[PDB]
Write an enzyme that holds these catalytic residues in place. Structure first.
Site, mmCIF file in Angstrom:
data_model
loop_
_atom_site.group_PDB
_atom_site.id
_atom_site.type_symbol
_atom_site.label_atom_id
_atom_site.label_comp_id
_atom_site.label_asym_id
_atom_site.label_seq_id
_atom_site.Cartn_x
_atom_site.Cartn_y
_atom_site.Cartn_z
ATOM 1 N N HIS A 186 83.468 -4.329 -4.404
ATOM 2 C CA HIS A 186 83.559 -5.747 -4.837
ATOM 3 C C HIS A 186 83.641 -6.685 -3.574
ATOM 4 C CE1 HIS A 186 84.249 -5.811 -9.451
ATOM 5 N NE2 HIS A 186 84.394 -4.634 -8.963
ATOM 6 N N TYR A 194 87.191 0.517 -5.556
ATOM 7 C CA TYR A 194 86.908 -0.718 -6.468
ATOM 8 C C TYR A 194 86.668 -2.070 -5.518
ATOM 9 C CZ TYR A 194 87.493 -4.251 -10.056
ATOM 10 O OH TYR A 194 87.259 -5.191 -10.984
ATOM 11 N N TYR A 248 86.453 -16.998 -10.538
ATOM 12 C CA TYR A 248 86.448 -15.619 -11.005
ATOM 13 C C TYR A 248 87.386 -15.032 -10.325
ATOM 14 C CZ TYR A 248 84.765 -11.089 -13.240
ATOM 15 O OH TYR A 248 84.319 -10.071 -13.836
ATOM 16 N N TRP A 307 74.717 -3.069 -12.236
ATOM 17 C CA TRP A 307 75.979 -3.159 -11.747
ATOM 18 C C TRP A 307 77.130 -2.403 -12.344
ATOM 19 C CZ3 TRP A 307 78.329 -4.122 -7.222
ATOM 20 C CH2 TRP A 307 79.636 -4.544 -7.207
ATOM 21 N N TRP A 308 76.823 -2.212 -13.572
ATOM 22 C CA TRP A 308 77.663 -1.413 -14.697
ATOM 23 C C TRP A 308 77.420 -0.080 -14.418
ATOM 24 C CZ3 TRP A 308 76.536 -4.042 -19.834
ATOM 25 C CH2 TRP A 308 77.109 -5.124 -20.018
#
EC number: 5.1.3.32
Lengths: 99, 99
Positions: free
Chosen positions: B22, B18, B41, B71-72
């Site tokens: 990112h 993850y 964010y 992206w999902w």
């Protein structure tokens, strides 16, 4: 300058009391937090799990301050707390930031 | 102008993946988020519960955007997701704010 986040625990059914007490947060405590570099301090609730997620910014020792300790004592009936009435707090590590 | 927070779920053991993905967030997605009013964010992890806590500011339809959907799809193996690969997301209600 630094972003901090942490998780706390509310006792079941105490959202209303928590919110009302924070709507009336003592001005002494707000000023102490500001004097210690805290800004943009938000606390969010997941009511169905009794979980609080806090976010704040810190721009460079509140645990030993008499007013903070009085606030802990005032809140201790509705929060999950330690013997000294400070809230249990789990730090959360930042894994993404986009300005 | 508005503060938003939400909770997501990572699959067990996938913190590293993850974080690395990112760190390499597509510039197209960063620009789309900015173009849609998102700033500041942050996503934080409680690794021991596989929980992500997100905070962002929104200054006034990304779910239908092709790059967001890509992206999902890219992230769907390590996140708890819906059939359309969008992450499961639980909104968190603000109960305190101090500027």
């Amino acid at each position: 300058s630094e972003r901090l986040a942490f998780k706390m625990k509310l006792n079941k059914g105490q959202k209303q009391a928590y919110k009302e007490r924070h709507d009336q947060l003592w001005p002494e405590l707000k000023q102490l937090l500001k004097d210690n570099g805290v800004s943009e301090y938000s606390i969010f609730i997941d009511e169905e799990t009794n979980t609080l997620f806090a976010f704040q910014k810190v721009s460079g020792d509140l645990a030993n301050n008499e007013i903070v300790k009085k606030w802990w004592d005032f809140m201790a009936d509705i929060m999950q707390v330690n013997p000294d009435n400070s809230p249990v707090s789990i730090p959360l590590e930042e894994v993404f930031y986009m300005e």
